[PDB]
Design a protein around this ligand. Structure first.
Ligand code: NAG
Lengths: 123, 214, 108, 196, 218
C-alpha cells in the first residue's frame, strides 16, 4: 500500500509530554528519512525537524531544539516524535513525511505523508 | 574426549510438563552443538532438534516445531528438552548427541532417557506359573506398571536356556512379560525351579516356585 | 535561516486563466531541493513538484514549477476545482528547512 | 618445523573494524590447533562444516584468518545465511561456509572512558556484498538520483557509522573481537597440514 | 528437506560373509569447499545408543574395525561389512549432516544367516491361581527357530481367534543364531470356562505339517 500511518490524537494537560508515532509500509525504509512538521488549524507550516533512518542523525528547528526528540526503530520501521513541556501554542496537527524508496534509489522529495496527528493541550 | 550424561528415566501422566537434561564434560565443550533425537518403542530414529550452548541458536525439525522446546545453560554445560502438558504419544527414549560443528556428524552420544507417559499408576506385578526329552517351564508376570522388572531363575543359579521376553503393553495400560526355560524333563521332580521377579518402582520382590502339573 | 517569502498573498481566478505563484528566498537556494506542495482543506500536504521543475507520480501535467537562485514560480494551465487548495514552498538544503507562509488560491 | 602464524592474528594488540576487516593467508606450515582449547576464554566458537577436533589430522590448500571487531548483538550475524547490515554491507560468509568463527569479549582493550570511536561499520551500500568482499569506500551514499557533490544532507548520508564502545555499556554493546578461519581444499596440492 | 531411503529393509548374511547396505539421497550432499560427501553411517545394538560408525561417506571413525567400509558419491552410498561377526548384529542408519533439518535412514536390520531351524512348540494352560482373579491367559512358546518369520494362530474348539492375542519375540541369540517367540491369549474366566479344548497352531519355514499343540480344560 506504501503509506505512512501515524498515531491517534491525544489530549494532554500543559506541562506533560506526547509521543507521536509514525510507521511506514510498502517501501524500503532502511535508507529513507522522516521529517516532522506541525501546522495549526488554518495557519502556516512550522517545520519541526528530520531524521535519517539508517543513521539516526537528527536535525531540529531553532525553536524546538530544546523540547523535541525524533527517534526511529528499524526492526518495526516506526518513527517517533516526542514533544515535552506542552504550552498552549503546541495545539496543532503533526505530520511525518518520507520519500519513496523502491530500490537502492529514493525520491528527491517527501511524497508520502501521514494522515496527521492533532495534539490538543487544554485543562 | 567428550562425554554426555543424561538424566534418569521419567514416568509421567498426560498433561504434565517435563524437562530432560543433558550435561557435557570433556575436552573443549565450547565447540559442541547438542542435538536431541527421539526413538519410539520400535525401530525409528527421528532427529528432533539441535542447539549451540554458546548463545541460544536453536533449530527445530518441522515435525517438532511447536511441540517441544530446546534450551541450554552454558554455566554448567547443559542442554534441556522441555514439554508442557505432554501427550501419551511421547513415550520413547530420547538421546542427546554432540557434534563439534553444526554440519558435523554426531560424534558423542548420551545414554538416553526413557519417558513413559501413561494415565495409569504404579501397580505391583502378579506372577503365575507355567508348568509342563525336553520340557519348558516358566513364569508370567502380568499387570505391572511401570517398566522394568528383573526376572531371574533360582536367584541366578541357572541362566543357560533362559529366555525372558520383552514386555507388551496391554489394553488396560499395564504390562505383561513371560520368562521361560528349557530343561531335560528328566529331572523335573529332582530339581526345583523358582522365579525371582523384582519390580523396584513398587518395591516388590516375588519368589514363586513352579511345580509340574499333577 | 533561509527565509522563504511567497507572493502574492491570495489569488482569485476562473477556469481557463493561467495562475502563477512565486516564492523567493533571502539567499541562493539549490534548485534540486525546493519542493512545491499542495494542501486541500482536510487532507495532508500533497507533493506536487519536487527538486525543481520535476513532477511527482500522479500529478496532472498542468502543474509546472520553474526557477533558480532566489526566485521560483509555479504555474497551472487548466484551472479545475481540483486545483483549489493552498500551496507551499519548502527548501531542504540549509541547516533548518523552511516553508512558505502559504498562498491561498480561492478559485471562483 | 615451521609453525603457522595463527598467534599473530589472535593475541594481536590492534584489531581492525568490520567494514575494513583484516585477512592473513596461511601456507607452507604446520597448523597445530591446540591453542583453540585451554587458552584464554572464548565467548563464541561456531564451526561450520569442519570439526576442529579433527583439524589436527587434515591438510588444506587455502587457509584464511580474518579478524575484526564488532559488538555482541552482531556476533550472531557472522554466520552463513545471516542477514542485517553486518552480513550485507560489511562481512558476508557464503552458504557453503567451511570453517570456524571464534569471538571473545574485548571490553578491557577496545573501550575508553570517553568512548572509542575508531571502530566503524558500513551503514549504506548500493548492493549486498558477495562472499569475502571488502569495501572501504568513503563516498557519500547517493541515496536518491541527485548527485552528492561531497556534501551531506537529504539523500546524501555518510556510509560509515561509529560504534562508540563504552565500558559502562551492556554486554550486547561491548566490543567483541572476532576471528574467522576459512579452510578450502581445491585442485591445488594441500600445504597447510596439521600434526599427523 | 533431504530424504534418505535404505534399499534393504532386512539383511540376512551368513557368518564371515559380505553385507551391503545402500542409501539413496534425494539431493546431493557434496560440499564445493572440500569436495566431501556429508553423509554418516551409525550402528546401534539392542539397548545401546547409536555409535558413529563412519563419517564423510568414506572416512572411518577413530574406533571402528577395518571391515566397516563406506563408499559412494553424489546420491548413492554403500556401507559394506567384509567379515560379519556376531558383534555386528545391530541396526544401521545413514544420516545426512549437509543441511538442517537432519534426516536419518529407514534402518537396516542385520542378522546372522543360520540354517533353517524348526521351532520347539509348547503350550501352557492358565494356572488355578490365576483363575481366582477372574481372567485366564493361555501361553504358547516357540523356542529356538529360524528364520524369524513365523505365524501363530489360536483355536478354541477349532475356532480361529483374533483380536485377543499378544506376541513378543526375542533378539537373535548370538550362540545359535535363533529366535524365540511367546504368544499370550487372554480371556475372561467366564468366557474361558465355556470352552473345552485350546490349541496353538504354528506355521514356519521348515515345518512339514503345521504344529498344533492342544490341551483340554479337563
Ligand atoms: C603472541 O603469540 C605469539 C606466538 O605464541 C608470540 O610470538 C608473540 O610474542 C605473542 N605476543 C604477545 C604480545 O604476547
Amino acid at each position: 500500500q506504501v503509506q505512512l500511518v501515524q498515531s491517534g490524537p491525544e489530549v494532554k494537560k500543559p506541562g506533560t509530554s506526547v509521543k507521536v508515532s509514525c510507521k511506514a509500509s510498502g517501501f524500503t525504509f532502511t535508507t529513507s528519512a522522516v521529517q516532522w512538521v506541525r501546522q495549526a488549524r488554518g495557519q502556516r507550516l512550522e517545520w519541526i525537524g528530520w531524521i535519517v533512518v539508517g543513521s539516526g542523525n537528527t536535525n531540529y528547528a531553532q525553536k524546538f531544539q530544546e523540547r523535541v526528540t525524533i527517534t526511529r526503530d528499524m526492526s518495526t520501521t516506526t518513527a517517533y516524535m516526542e514533544l515535552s513541556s506542552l504550552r498552549s501554542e503546541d495545539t496543532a496537527v503533526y505530520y511525518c513525511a518520507a520519500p519513496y524508496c523502491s530500490g537502492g534509489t529514493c525520491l528527491d522529495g517527501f511524497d508520502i505523508w501521514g494522515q496527521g496527528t492533532m495534539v490538543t493541550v487544554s485543562s | 574426549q567428550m562425554q554426555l550424561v543424561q538424566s534418569g528415566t521419567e514416568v509421567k501422566k498426560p498433561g504434565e510438563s517435563l524437562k530432560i537434561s543433558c550435561k557435557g564434560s570433556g575436552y573443549g565443550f565450547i565447540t559442541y552443538w547438542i542435538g536431541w533425537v527421539r526413538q519410539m518403542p520400535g525401530k525409528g530414529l527421528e532427529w528432533m532438534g539441535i542447539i549451540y550452548p554458546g548463545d541460544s541458536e536453536t533449530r527445530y525439525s518441522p515435525s517438532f516445531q511447536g511441540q517441544v522446546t530446546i534450551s541450554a545453560d552454558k554455566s554448567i554445560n547443559t542442554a534441556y528438552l522441555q514439554w508442557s502438558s505432554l501427550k501419551a504419544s511421547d513415550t520413547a527414549i530420547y538421546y542427546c548427541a554432540g557434534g563439534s560443528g553444526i554440519s558435523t556428524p554426531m560424534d558423542v552420544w548420551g545414554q538416553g532417557t526413557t519417558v513413559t507417559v501413561s494415565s495409569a499408576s504404579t501397580k505391583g506385578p502378579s506372577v503365575f506359573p507355567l508348568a509342563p526329552g525336553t520340557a519348558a517351564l516358566g513364569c508370567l508376570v502380568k499387570d505391572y506398571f511401570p517398566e522394568p522388572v528383573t526376572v531371574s531363575w533360582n536367584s541366578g543359579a541357572l541362566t543357560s536356556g533362559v529366555h525372558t521376553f520383552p514386555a507388551v503393553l496391554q489394553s488396560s495400560g499395564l504390562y505383561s512379560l513371560s520368562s521361560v526355560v528349557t530343561v531335560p524333563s528328566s529331572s523335573l521332580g529332582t530339581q526345583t525351579y523358582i522365579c525371582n521377579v523384582n519390580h523396584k518402582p513398587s518395591n516388590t520382590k516375588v519368589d514363586k516356585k513352579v511345580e509340574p502339573k499333577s | 535561516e533561509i527565509v522563504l517569502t511567497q507572493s502574492p498573498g491570495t489569488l482569485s481566478l476562473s477556469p481557463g486563466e493561467r495562475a502563477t505563484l512565486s516564492c523567493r528566498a533571502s539567499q541562493s537556494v539549490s534548485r534540486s531541493y525546493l519542493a512545491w506542495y499542495q494542501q486541500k482543506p482536510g487532507q495532508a500536504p500533497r507533493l506536487l513538484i519536487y527538486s525543481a521543475s520535476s513532477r511527482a507520480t500522479g500529478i496532472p501535467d498542468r502543474f509546472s514549477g520553474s526557477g533558480s537562485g532566489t526566485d521560483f514560480t509555479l504555474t497551472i494551465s487548466r484551472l479545475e476545482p481540483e486545483d483549489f487548495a493552498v500551496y507551499y514552498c519548502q527548501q531542504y538544503g540549509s541547516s533548518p528547512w523552511t516553508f512558505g507562509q502559504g498562498t491561498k488560491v480561492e478559485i471562483k | 618445523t615451521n609453525l603457522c602464524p595463527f598467534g599473530e592474528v589472535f593475541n594481536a594488540t590492534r584489531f581492525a573494524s568490520v567494514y575494513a576487516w583484516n585477512r592473513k593467508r596461511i601456507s607452507n606450515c604446520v597448523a597445530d590447533y591446540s591453542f583453540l582449547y585451554n587458552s584464554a576464554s572464548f565467548s563464541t566458537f561456531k564451526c561450520y562444516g569442519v570439526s576442529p577436533t579433527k583439524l589436527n589430522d587434515l591438510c588444506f590448500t587455502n587457509v584464511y584468518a580474518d579478524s575484526f571487531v564488532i559488538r555482541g548483538d552482531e556476533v550472531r550475524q557472522i554466520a552463513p545465511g545471516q542477514t542485517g547490515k553486518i552480513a550485507d554491507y560489511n562481512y558476508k560468509l557464503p552458504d557453503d561456509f567451511t570453517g570456524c568463527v571464534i569471538a571473545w569479549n574485548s571490553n578491557n582493550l577496545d573501550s575508553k572512558v570517553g568512548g572509542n570511536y575508531n571502530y566503524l561499520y558500513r551503514l549504506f551500500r548500493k548492493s549486498n556484498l558477495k562472499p569475502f568482499e571488502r569495501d572501504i569506500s568513503t563516498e557519500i551514499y547517493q541515496a536518491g538520483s541527485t548527485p552528492c557533490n561531497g556534501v551531506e544532507g537529504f539523500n546524501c548520508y555518510f556510509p560509515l557509522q561509529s560504534y562508540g564502545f563504552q565500558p559502562t555499556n551492556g554486554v550486547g554493546y561491548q566490543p567483541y573481537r572476532v576471528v574467522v578461519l576459512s579452510f578450502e581444499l581445491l585442485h591445488a596440492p594441500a600445504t597447510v597440514c596439521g600434526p599427523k
